[PDB]
Amino acid sequence: KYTTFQGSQNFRLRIVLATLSGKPIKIEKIRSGDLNPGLKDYEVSFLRLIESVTNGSVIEISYTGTTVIYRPGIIVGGASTHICPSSKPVGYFVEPMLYLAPFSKKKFSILFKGITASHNDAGIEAIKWGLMPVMEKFGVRECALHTLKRGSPPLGGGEVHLVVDSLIAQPITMHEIDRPIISSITGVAYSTRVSPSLVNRMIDGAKKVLKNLQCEVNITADVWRGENSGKSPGWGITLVAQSKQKGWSYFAEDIGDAGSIPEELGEKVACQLLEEISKSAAVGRNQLPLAIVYMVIGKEDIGRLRINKEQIDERFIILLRDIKKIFNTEVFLKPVDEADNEDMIATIKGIGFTNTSKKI
């Protein structure tokens, strides 16, 4: 009948996993006890986005809005424009499309409009330099997120264009049982509608923490001014630690609020980046959900990914349990033979998923 879920937890993942698996799902008891029960505006907008890129899907929203029945169709893609409500930035909507774009009948060319940054959702640079590189490791050769206009909160006004030219049968099998060596640190510090000095000052704060390291540190100054700088002033910084040997990356990001010192923010992201590296084995915690899902939908082969003991947190477990409900696939974890660390190897067998929407 229907695979039933509870609450608003992992709303995007459960819908995305249903779309890839093709199995209808039911999400019930969405904020039942809250004063404003049911789906939020941005959740309803996300469902509309799912339909613009699929065909033949049926989405029922209950009279109270507290229950959703989703019967997925085929992923078709194509060119479209999506208006993101101000409750969430564009990255809230761009991120799930990364899971569906390579397995589509037609190339995804989606134009997203709205706020381009927030404190809780993926930024433009997190996607461009933090997630999309993981996709290329899985065989998505051509993927691009062009930023046409930057829009900072609360008024937004930004525009990003997601273009995924690569249509593939399925992700390649992953074999990463080592700890990548970080070759250099790169990042982007950006600002809109304000003086360049803020961008320079953040770079000084970040470089202060990272100068002790033995690798090169080169942070870009992304100063936006004029018509494309959006409607509200804002600034932020994103740092990426790169491993050129196998094209791996770890990143942290944050944006500045009113009354915040640019130098302090640069130190926060630099400190968080070192926290992320210490907690990571082969991918960061913010990249781990994407890597696991792609390995689940690979060929029917045992792919291996090294994970740190710290990465096995509350979020990791719920992701695995949700995958088992949809795909029935169990992740097997084995200790590494080394004694320097307590890492583990997460071995997942692919379900033999294939891109059947693409005409041959």
Least CB distance from residue 214 to other proteins, whole Å?
6
Residue selected from 9, 80, 81, 356 as contacting other proteins according to rule CB under 8 A: 9
Residue selected from 25, 27, 122, 296 as contacting other proteins according to rule CB under 8 A: 122
Q: Could you give the CA distance from residue 217 to residue 266 in angstroms, rounded to a whole number?
A: 13
User: 103 vs 224, which CB is nearer to other proteins?
Assistant: 224
Contact letters for other proteins, residues 17-56 (x by CB under 8 A): ---------------------x-----x--xx--x---xx
Least CB distance from residue 113 to other proteins, whole Å?
15
* Interacting residues with other proteins between 161 and 190 (CB under 8 A): 173, 175, 179, 181-183
User: Applying CB under 8 A, what is the total number of residues that bind other proteins?
Assistant: 106
User: 25 vs 331, which CB is nearer to other proteins?
Assistant: 331
**CA contacts within 13 A on the Cβ side of 217:** 17
Asked if 197 touches other proteins (CB under 8 A), the answer is: yes
Which residues in the chain are followed by a discontinuity, with C-to-N distance exceeding 2.5 angstroms? none
- Check if the beta carbon of residue 159 is closer than 8 Å to that of residue 151: yes
Least CB distance from residue 355 to other proteins, whole Å?
20
Residue with tokens 């200790």: 335
Q: Could you give the CA distance from residue 133 to residue 36 in angstroms, rounded to a whole number?
A: 39
Tokens representing 48? 């509309």
DSSP letters along 17-69, please?
HHHHHT--EEEE-TTSSSSS-S--HHHHHHHHHHHHHEES-EEEE-SSSS-EE
* Interacting residues with other proteins between 321 and 360 (CB under 8 A): 321, 324, 330-334, 340, 347, 349
Contact letters for other proteins, residues 280-319 (x by CB under 8 A): ----xxx--x-----------xx-x-------xxxx-xxx
Least CB distance from residue 77 to other proteins, whole Å?
13
DSSP letters along 286-341, please?
TTHHHHHHHHHTS-SSEEEEEE-TTT-SHHHHHHHHHHHHHH----EEEE-S-SS-
Name 47's Cβ contacts closer than 8 Å, sequence gap at least 6: 15, 39, 59, 61, 68, 70
* Interacting residues with other proteins between 98 and 117 (CB under 8 A): none
Q: Find the Cα–Cα–Cα–Cα dihedral 29, 34, 40, 43, rounded to 10°.
A: -30
* Interacting residues with other proteins between 219 and 278 (CB under 8 A): 221-229, 233-235, 253-254, 258-259, 261, 264, 267-268, 271-272, 274-278
What are the φ and ψ backbone dihedral angles of 127, each rounded to 5 degrees?
A: -70, -45
Q: Which stretch binds other proteins (CB under 8 A): 24-32, 97-105, 107-115, 146-154?
A: 146-154
User: 103 vs 308, which CB is nearer to other proteins?
Assistant: 308
User: 83 vs 317, which CB is nearer to other proteins?
Assistant: 317
